[PDB]
Coordinates of C-alpha atoms and ligand atoms in Angstrom, one line a residue:
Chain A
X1 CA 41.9 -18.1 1.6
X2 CA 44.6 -20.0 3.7
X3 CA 42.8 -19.1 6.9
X4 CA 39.2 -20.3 5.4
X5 CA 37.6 -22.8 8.1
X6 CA 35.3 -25.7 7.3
X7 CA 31.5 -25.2 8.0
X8 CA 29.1 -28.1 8.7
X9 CA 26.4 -26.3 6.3
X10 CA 26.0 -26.3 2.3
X11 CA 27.9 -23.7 0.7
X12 CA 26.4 -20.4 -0.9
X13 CA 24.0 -21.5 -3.7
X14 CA 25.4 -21.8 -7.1
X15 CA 25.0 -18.2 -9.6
X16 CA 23.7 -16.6 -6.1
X17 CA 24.6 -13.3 -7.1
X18 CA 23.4 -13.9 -10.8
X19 CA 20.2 -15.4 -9.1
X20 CA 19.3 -12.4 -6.9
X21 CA 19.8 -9.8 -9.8
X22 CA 17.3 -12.0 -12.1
X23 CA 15.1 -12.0 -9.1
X24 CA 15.5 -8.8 -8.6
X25 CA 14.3 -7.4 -12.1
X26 CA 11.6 -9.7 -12.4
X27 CA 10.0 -9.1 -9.3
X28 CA 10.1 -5.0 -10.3
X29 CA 8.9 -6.4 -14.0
X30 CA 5.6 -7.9 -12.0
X31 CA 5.3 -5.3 -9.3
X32 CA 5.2 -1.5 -11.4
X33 CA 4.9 0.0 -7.7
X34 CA 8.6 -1.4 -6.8
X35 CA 10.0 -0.6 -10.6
X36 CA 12.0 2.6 -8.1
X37 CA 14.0 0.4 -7.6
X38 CA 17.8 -0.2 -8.3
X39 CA 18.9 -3.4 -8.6
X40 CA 22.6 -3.1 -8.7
X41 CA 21.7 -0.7 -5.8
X42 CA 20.0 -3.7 -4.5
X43 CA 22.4 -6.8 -5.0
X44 CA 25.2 -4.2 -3.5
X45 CA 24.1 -3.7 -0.6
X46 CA 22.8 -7.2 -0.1
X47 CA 26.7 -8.5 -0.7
X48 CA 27.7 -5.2 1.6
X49 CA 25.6 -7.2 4.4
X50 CA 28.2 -10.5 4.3
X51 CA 30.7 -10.3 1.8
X52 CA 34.1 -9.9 4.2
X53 CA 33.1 -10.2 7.1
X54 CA 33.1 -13.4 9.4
X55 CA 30.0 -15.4 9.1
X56 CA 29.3 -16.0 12.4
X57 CA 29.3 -12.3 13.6
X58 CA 26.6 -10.9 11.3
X59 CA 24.4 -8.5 12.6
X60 CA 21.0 -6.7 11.9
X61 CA 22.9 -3.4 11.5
X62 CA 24.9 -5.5 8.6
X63 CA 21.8 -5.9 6.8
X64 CA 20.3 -2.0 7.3
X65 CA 21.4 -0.8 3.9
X66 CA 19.1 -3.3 2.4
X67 CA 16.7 -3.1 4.2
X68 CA 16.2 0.6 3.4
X69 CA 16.7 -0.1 -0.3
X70 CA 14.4 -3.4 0.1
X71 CA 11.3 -0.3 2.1
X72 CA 7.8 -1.8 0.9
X73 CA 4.6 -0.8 2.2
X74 CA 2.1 -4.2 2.6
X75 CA -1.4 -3.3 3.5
X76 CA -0.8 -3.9 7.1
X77 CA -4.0 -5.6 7.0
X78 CA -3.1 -8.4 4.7
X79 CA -0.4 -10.3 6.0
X80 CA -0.1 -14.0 6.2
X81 CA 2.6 -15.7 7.9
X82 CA 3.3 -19.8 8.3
X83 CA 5.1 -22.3 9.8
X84 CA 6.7 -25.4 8.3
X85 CA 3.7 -24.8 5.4
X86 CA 5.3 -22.6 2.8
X87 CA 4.3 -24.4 0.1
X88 CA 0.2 -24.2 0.8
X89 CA 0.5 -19.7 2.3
X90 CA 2.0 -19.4 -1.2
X91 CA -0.5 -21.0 -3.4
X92 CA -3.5 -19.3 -1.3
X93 CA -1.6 -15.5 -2.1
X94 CA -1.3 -16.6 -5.6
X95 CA -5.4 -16.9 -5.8
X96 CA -5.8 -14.0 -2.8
X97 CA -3.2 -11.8 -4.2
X98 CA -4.4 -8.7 -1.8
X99 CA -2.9 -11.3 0.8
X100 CA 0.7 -11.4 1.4
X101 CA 3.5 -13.3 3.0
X102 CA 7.1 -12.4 3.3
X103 CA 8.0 -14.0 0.4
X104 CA 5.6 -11.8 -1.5
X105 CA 7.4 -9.1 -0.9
X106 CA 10.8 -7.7 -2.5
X107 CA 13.3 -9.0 0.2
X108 CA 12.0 -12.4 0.9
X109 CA 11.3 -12.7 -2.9
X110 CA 15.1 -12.1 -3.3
X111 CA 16.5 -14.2 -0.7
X112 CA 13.6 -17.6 -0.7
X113 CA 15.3 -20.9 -0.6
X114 CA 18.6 -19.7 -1.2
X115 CA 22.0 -19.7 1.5
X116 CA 24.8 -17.6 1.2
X117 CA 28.0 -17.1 3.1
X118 CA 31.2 -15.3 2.8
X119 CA 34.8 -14.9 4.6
X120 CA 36.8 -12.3 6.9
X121 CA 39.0 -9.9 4.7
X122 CA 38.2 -11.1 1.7
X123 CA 35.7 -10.7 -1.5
X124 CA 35.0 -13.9 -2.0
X125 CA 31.9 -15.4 -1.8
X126 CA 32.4 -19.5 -0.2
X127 CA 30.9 -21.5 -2.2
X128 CA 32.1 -24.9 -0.1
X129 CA 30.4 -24.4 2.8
X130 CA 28.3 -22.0 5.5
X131 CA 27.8 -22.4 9.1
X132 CA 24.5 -24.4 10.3
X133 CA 23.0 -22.4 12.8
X134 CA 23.5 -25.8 15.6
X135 CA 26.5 -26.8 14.7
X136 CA 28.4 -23.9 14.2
X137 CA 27.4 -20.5 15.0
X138 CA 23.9 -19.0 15.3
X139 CA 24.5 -15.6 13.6
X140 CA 25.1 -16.6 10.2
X141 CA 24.4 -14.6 7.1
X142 CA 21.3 -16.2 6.8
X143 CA 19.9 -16.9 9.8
X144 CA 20.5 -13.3 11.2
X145 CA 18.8 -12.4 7.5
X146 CA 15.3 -14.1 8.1
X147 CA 15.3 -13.0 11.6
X148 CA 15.7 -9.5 10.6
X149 CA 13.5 -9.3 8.0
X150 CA 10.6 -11.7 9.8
X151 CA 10.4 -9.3 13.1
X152 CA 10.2 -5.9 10.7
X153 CA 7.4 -7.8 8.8
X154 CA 5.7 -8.6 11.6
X155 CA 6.1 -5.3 13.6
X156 CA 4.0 -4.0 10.3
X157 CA 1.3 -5.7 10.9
X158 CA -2.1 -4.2 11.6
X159 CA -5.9 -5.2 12.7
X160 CA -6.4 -9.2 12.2
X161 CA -3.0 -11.3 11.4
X162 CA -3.3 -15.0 9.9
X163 CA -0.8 -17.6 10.3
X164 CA -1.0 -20.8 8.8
X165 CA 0.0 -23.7 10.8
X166 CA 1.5 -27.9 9.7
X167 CA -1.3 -29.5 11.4
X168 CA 0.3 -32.9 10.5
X169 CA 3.5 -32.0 12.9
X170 CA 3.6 -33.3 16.2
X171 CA 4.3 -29.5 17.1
X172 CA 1.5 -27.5 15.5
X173 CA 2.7 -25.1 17.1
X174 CA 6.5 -25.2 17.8
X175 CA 8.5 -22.2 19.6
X176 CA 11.7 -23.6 18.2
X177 CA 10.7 -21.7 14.5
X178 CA 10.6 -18.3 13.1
X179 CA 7.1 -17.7 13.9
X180 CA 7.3 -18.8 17.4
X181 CA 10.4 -17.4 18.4
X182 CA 10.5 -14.0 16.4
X183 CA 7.0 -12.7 14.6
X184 CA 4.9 -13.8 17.5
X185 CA 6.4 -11.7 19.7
X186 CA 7.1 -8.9 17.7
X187 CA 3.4 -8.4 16.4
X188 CA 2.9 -5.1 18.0
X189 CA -0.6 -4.9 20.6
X190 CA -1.1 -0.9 19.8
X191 CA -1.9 -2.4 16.1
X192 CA -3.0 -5.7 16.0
X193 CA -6.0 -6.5 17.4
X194 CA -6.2 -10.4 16.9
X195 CA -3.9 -13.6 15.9
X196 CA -6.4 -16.1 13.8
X197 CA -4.3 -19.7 12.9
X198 CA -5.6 -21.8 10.1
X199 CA -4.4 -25.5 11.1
X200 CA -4.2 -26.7 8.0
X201 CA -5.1 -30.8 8.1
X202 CA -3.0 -33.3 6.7
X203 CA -1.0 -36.7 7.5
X204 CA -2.3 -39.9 8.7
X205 CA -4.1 -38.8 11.5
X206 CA -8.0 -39.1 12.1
X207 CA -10.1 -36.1 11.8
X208 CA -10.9 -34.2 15.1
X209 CA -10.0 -30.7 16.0
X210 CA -6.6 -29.7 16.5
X211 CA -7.4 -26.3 17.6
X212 CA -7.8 -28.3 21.0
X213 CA -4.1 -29.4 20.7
X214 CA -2.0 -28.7 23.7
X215 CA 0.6 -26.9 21.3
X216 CA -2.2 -24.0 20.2
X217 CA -3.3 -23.8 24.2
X218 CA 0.6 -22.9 24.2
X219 CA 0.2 -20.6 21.4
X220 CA -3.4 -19.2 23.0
X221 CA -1.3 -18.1 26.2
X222 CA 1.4 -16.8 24.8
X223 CA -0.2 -14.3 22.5
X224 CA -3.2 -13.5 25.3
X225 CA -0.1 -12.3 27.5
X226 CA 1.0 -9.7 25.0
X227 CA -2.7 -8.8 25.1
X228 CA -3.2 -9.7 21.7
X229 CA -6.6 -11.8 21.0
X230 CA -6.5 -15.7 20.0
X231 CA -8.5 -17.2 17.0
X232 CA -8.2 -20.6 15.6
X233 CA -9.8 -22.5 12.7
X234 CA -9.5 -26.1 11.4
X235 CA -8.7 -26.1 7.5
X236 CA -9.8 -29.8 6.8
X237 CA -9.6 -30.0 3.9
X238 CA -6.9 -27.6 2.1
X239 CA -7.6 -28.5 -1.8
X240 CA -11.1 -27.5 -1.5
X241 CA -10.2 -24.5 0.5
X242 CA -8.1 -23.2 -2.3
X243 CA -11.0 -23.7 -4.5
X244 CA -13.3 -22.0 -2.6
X245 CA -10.7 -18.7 -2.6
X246 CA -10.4 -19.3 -6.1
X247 CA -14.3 -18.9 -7.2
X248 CA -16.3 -18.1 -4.3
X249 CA -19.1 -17.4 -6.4
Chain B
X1 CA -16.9 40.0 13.7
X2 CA -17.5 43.7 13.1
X3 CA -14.7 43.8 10.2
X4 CA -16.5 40.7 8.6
X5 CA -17.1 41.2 4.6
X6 CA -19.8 39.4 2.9
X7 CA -18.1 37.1 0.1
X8 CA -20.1 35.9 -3.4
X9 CA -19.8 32.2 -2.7
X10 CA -21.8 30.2 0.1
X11 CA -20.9 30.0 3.3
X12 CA -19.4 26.8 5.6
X13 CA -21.7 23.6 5.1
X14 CA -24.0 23.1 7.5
X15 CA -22.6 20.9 10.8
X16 CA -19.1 21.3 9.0
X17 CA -17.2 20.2 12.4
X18 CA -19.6 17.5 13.1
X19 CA -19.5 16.1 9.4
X20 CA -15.3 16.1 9.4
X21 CA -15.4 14.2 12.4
X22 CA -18.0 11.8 11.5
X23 CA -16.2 11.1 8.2
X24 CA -12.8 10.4 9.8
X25 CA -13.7 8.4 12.2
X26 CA -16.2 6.5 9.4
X27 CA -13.3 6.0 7.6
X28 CA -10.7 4.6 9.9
X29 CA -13.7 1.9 11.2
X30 CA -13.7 0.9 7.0
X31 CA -9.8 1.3 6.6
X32 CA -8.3 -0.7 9.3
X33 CA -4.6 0.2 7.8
X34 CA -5.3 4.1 9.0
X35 CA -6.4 3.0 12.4
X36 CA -3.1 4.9 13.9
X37 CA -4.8 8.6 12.9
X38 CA -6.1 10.3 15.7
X39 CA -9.4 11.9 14.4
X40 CA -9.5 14.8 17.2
X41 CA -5.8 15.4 15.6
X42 CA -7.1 15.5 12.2
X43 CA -9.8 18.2 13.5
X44 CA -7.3 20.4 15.1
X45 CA -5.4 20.4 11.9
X46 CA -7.7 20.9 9.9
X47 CA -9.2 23.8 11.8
X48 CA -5.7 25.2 12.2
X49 CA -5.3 25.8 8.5
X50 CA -8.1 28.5 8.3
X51 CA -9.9 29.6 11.3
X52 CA -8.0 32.5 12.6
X53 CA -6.8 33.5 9.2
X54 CA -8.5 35.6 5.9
X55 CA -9.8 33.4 3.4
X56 CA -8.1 35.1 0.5
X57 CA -4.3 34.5 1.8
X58 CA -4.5 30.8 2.2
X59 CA -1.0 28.8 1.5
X60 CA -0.4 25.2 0.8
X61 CA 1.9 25.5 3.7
X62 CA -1.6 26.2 6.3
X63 CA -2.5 22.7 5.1
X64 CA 0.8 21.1 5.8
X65 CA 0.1 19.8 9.3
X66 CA -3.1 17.9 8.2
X67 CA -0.7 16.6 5.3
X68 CA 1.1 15.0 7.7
X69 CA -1.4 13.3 9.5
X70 CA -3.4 12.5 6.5
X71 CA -0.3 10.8 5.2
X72 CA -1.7 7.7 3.1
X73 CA 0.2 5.1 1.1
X74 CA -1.8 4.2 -2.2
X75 CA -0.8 1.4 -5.2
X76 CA 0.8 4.0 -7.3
X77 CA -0.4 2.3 -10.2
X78 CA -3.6 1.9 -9.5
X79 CA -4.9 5.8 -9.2
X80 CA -8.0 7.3 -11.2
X81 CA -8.5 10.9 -11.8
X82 CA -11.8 12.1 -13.2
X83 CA -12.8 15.9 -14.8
X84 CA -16.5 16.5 -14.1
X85 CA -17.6 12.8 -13.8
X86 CA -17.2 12.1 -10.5
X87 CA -20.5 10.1 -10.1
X88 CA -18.8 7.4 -12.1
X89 CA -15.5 7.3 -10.8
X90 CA -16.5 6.7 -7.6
X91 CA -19.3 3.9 -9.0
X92 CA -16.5 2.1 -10.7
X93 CA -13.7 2.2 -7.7
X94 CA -17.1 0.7 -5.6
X95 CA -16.8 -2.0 -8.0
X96 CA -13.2 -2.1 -8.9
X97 CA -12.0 -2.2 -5.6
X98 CA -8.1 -2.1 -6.1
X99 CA -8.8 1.1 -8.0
X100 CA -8.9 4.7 -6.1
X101 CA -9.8 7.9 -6.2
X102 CA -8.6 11.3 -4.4
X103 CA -12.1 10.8 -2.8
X104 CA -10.8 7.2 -1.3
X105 CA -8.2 8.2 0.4
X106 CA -9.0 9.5 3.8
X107 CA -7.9 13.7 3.2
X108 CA -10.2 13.4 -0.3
X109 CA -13.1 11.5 1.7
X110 CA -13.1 14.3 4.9
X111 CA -13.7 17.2 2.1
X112 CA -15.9 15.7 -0.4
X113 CA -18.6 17.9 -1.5
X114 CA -18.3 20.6 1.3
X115 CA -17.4 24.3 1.9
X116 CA -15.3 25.8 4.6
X117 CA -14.0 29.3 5.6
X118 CA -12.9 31.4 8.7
X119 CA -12.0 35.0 9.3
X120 CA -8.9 36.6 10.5
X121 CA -8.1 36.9 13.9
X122 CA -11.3 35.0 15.7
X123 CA -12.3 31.6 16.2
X124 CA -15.4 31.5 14.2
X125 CA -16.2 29.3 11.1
X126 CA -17.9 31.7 8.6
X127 CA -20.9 30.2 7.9
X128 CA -22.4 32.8 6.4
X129 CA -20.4 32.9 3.1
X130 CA -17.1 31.9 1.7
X131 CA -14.8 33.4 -0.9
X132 CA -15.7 32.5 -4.6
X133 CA -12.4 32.2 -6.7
X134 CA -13.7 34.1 -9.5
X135 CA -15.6 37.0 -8.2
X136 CA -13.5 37.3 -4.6
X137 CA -10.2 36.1 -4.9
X138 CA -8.4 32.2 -5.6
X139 CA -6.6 31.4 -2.8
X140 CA -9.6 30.4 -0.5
X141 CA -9.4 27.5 1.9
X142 CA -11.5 25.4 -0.5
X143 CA -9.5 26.0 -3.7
X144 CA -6.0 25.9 -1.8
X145 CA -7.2 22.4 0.0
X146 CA -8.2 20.7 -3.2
X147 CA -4.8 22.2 -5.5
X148 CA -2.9 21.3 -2.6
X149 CA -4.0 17.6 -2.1
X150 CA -4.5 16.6 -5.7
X151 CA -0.8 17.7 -6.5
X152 CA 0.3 15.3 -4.1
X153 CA -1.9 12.4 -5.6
X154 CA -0.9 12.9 -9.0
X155 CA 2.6 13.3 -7.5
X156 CA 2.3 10.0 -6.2
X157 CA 1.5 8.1 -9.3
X158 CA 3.7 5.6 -11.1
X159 CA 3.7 3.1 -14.1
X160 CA 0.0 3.7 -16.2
X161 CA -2.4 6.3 -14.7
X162 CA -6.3 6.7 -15.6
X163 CA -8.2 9.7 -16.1
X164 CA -11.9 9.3 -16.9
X165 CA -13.5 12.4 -18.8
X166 CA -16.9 13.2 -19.7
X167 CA -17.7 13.2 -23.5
X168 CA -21.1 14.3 -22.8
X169 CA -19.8 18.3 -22.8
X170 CA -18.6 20.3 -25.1
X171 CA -14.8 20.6 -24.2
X172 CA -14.7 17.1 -23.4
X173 CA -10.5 18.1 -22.3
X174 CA -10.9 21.5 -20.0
X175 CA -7.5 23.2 -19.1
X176 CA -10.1 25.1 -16.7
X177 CA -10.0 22.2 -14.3
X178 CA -8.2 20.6 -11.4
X179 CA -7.4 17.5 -13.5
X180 CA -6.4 20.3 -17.1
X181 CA -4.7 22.6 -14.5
X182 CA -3.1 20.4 -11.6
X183 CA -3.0 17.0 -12.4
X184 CA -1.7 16.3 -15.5
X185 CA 1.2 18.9 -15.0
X186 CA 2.2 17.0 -11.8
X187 CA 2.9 13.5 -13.0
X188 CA 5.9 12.9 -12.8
X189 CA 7.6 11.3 -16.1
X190 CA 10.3 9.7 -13.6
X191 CA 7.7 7.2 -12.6
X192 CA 4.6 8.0 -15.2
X193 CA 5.0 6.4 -18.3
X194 CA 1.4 6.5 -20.1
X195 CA -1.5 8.5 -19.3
X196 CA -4.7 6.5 -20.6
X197 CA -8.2 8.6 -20.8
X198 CA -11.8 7.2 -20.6
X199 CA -13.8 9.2 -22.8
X200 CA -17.2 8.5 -21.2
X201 CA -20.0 9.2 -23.7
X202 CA -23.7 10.5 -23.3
X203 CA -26.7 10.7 -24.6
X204 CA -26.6 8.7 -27.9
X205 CA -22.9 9.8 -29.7
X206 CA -23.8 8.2 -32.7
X207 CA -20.7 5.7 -32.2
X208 CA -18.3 8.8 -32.9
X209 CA -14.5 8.2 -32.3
X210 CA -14.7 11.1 -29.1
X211 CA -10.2 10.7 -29.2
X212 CA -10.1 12.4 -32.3
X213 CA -11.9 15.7 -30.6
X214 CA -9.8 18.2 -30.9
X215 CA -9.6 18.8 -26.8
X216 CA -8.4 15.7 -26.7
X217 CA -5.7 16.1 -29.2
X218 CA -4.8 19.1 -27.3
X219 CA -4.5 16.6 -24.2
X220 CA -2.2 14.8 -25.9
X221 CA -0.1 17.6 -26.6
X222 CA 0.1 18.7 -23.6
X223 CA 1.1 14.9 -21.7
X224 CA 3.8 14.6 -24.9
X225 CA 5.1 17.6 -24.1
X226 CA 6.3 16.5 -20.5
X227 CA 7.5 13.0 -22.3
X228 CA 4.6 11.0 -21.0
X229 CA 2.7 8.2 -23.2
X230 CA -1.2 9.2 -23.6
X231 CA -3.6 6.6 -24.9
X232 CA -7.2 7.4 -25.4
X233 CA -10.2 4.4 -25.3
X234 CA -14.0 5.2 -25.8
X235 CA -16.0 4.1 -23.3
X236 CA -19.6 3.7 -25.1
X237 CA -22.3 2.1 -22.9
X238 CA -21.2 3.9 -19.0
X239 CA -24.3 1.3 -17.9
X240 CA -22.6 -1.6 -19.8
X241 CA -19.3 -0.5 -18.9
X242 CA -19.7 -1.1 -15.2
X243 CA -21.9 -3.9 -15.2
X244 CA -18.7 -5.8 -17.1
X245 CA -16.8 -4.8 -14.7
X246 CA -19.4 -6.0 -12.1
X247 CA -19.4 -9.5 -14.2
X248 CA -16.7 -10.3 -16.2
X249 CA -17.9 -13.8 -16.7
X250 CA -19.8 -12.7 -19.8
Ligands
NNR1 N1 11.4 -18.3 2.6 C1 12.5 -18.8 3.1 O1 13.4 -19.4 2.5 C2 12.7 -18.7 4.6 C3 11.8 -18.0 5.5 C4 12.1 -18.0 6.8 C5 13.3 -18.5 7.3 N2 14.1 -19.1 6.5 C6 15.4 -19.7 7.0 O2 16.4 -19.6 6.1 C7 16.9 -20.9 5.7 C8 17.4 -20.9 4.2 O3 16.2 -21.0 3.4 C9 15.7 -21.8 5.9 O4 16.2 -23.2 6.1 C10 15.3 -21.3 7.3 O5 16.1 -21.6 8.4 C11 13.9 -19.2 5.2
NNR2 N1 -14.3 15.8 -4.3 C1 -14.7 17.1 -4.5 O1 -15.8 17.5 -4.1 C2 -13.7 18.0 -5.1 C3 -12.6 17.6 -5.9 C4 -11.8 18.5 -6.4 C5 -12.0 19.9 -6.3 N2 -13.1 20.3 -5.6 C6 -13.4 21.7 -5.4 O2 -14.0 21.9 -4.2 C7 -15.3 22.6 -4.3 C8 -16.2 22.3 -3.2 O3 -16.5 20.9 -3.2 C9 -15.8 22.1 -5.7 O4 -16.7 23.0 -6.3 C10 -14.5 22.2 -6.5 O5 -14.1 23.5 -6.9 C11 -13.9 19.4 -5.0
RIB3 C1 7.1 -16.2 9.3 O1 6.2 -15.8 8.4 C2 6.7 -15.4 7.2 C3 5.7 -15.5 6.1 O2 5.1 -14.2 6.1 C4 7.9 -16.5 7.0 O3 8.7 -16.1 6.1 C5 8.4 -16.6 8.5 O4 9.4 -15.7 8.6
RIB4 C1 -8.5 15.2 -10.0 O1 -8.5 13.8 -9.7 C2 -9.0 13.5 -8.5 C3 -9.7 12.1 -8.4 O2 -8.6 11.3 -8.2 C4 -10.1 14.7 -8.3 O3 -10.3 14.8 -7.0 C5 -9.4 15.9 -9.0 O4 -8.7 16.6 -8.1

């Protein structure tokens, strides 16, 4: 387009659309429960969300249709949410497979580690560039994504929420990040009875307990306001946790 | 009540209001993900779809209200019926705990094992005796609860669903059943693509191939005729069977 703006961000991923449809039909191939679903249904109103529209005035309501399509139920029970540590919530739902994180599920499945963006009054996905959520615009078709799908994942929530927490970060707890800033205040008190964090130990950094770090008194205050109860555990040493979920026989 | 009849079949359990109660409230401390159901609810809808009413006019629609709240979200693939084995079924989803039966879910749990009638036009459970659907009539609270719910659980099922039968009998397959009668007519082929039977054998069956009986061929007929898969497996030892499933390493 000759009205097409510059963004500071990477473009959409390359084969995006090819890549969700894939996604799409594998996850029903693993999942019988979800095989309901439509995946042309599926990628078409996930393109609806963005595709035309200006990418810094996305909305929730943009992404409603999919969500609908997207409806899963996760045993409330079971959820495991993280910050900054994808990589180690993932492998522990591979062994625990009754637990799950958002990517676990159908939506986040779709969309994990992928960006997309699109232009104003046209069809065209922009393949060039997308805004970053500093530099340019904070309700971009990604960011407003996450945050959508994060809070309605959290508001699910029932009984005993885990989160796992980058215990190597200066901010092991950090309110500038999806769990600090949406699913900890959308876990809902009239359902969840307790927060439990697993700091999970790492870096260069002598062992002592971090659940004495000034960033989980933080967290501890915040959640005890929304008269939700505060549990923390030290995971020293994550490969031999894994193991231990693995064969605890 | 003065217009009371006596009915062939036995009357309410024993501490019937106390024992629903106890049960739901049982089960939502075990099943934190059904936490949000009011047990004094449950009651009152329960007790709403008989008391006050004759036990031989019962409709599905007097148990919709405790539908509602009993409203429970199983892995579709992942459901077990069972004809006349119910011991086992319920010993193997102790075991195989990502497996369930009618009996797991929290409407199947409240009713297990127990009787229950009322009379028309007064509060009163009838503990004296209930309506047998042979001799008095069919559409008693009892028979109309169980057709009702199990409906909706085979409704619910999708991908590969398991029915365990007992081989021990004579008509190992019994269209005289909830499972020959209900069940199997109510998968929907939409989302049901193979029903799988476990033949559970007796007392010493002399290693016989049980899916050839011809009940079971008849089963077969049936499920093709609504253009669902069937697949039939003998299950041998019961004893060993569960103990493998208890251990797999070996
Ligand atoms: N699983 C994910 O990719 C994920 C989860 C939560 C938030 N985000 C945000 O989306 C961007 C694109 O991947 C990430 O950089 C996060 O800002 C991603
Ligand atoms: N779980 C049960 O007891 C069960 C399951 C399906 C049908 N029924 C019927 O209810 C009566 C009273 O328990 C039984 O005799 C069955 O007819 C019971
Ligand atoms: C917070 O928790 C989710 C994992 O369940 C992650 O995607 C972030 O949104
Ligand atoms: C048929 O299957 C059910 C077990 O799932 C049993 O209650 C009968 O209704």
């Amino acid at each position: 387009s000759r009205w097409r703006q510059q963004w500071s961000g990477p473009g959409t991923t390359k084969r995006f659309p090819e890549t969700v449809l894939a996604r799409c039909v594998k996850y029903t191939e693993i999942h019988p429960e979800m095989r309901h679903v439509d995946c042309q249904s599926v990628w078409d109103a996930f393109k609806g969300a963005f595709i035309s529209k200006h990418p810094c005035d996305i909305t929730e309501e943009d992404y409603q249709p999919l969500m609908k399509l997207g409806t899963q139920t996760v045993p409330c029970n079971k959820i495991l949410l993280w910050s900054r540590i994808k990589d180690l919530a993932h492998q522990f739902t591979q062994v625990q497979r009754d637990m799950f994180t958002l990517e676990d599920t159908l939506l986040g499945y779709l969309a994990d580690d992928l960006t997309w963006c699109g232009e104003f009054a046209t069809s065209k996905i922009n393949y060039q560039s997308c805004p970053d959520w500093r530099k340019d615009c904070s309700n971009n078709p990604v960011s407003v994504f996450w945050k959508t799908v994060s809070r309605r994942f959290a508001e699910a929530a029932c009984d005993v929420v885990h989160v796992m927490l980058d215990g190597s970060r200066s901010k092991i707890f950090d309110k500038d990040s999806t769990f600090g800033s949406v699913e900890v205040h959308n876990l809902q008190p009239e359902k969840v009875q307790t927060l439990e964090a697993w700091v999970i130990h790492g870096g260069r950094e002598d062992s002592r307990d971090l659940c004495q770090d000034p960033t989980i008194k933080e967290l501890e205050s915040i959640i005890s306001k929304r008269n939700i109860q505060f549990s923390c555990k030290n995971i020293y040493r994550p490969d031999k946790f894994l193991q231990c979920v693995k064969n605890p026989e």
